[PDB]
Point group: C2
Chain length 25, copies 2
């Protein structure tokens, strides 16, 4: 049940990061 | 520059969505 949440939190961070980068860089 | 942010926020919200599901459902 958490194996998904781990991967869910995984992609959540990667997309937010790329969003952050795209705004200022 | 603008469209780069959109597609990122796009991907951001989806990643965020999937994360909310894995926790509540």
């Amino acid at each position: 049940y958490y194996k998904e949440i781990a991967h869910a939190l995984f992609s959540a961070l990667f997309a937010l990061s790329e969003l952050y980068i795209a705004v200022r860089y």
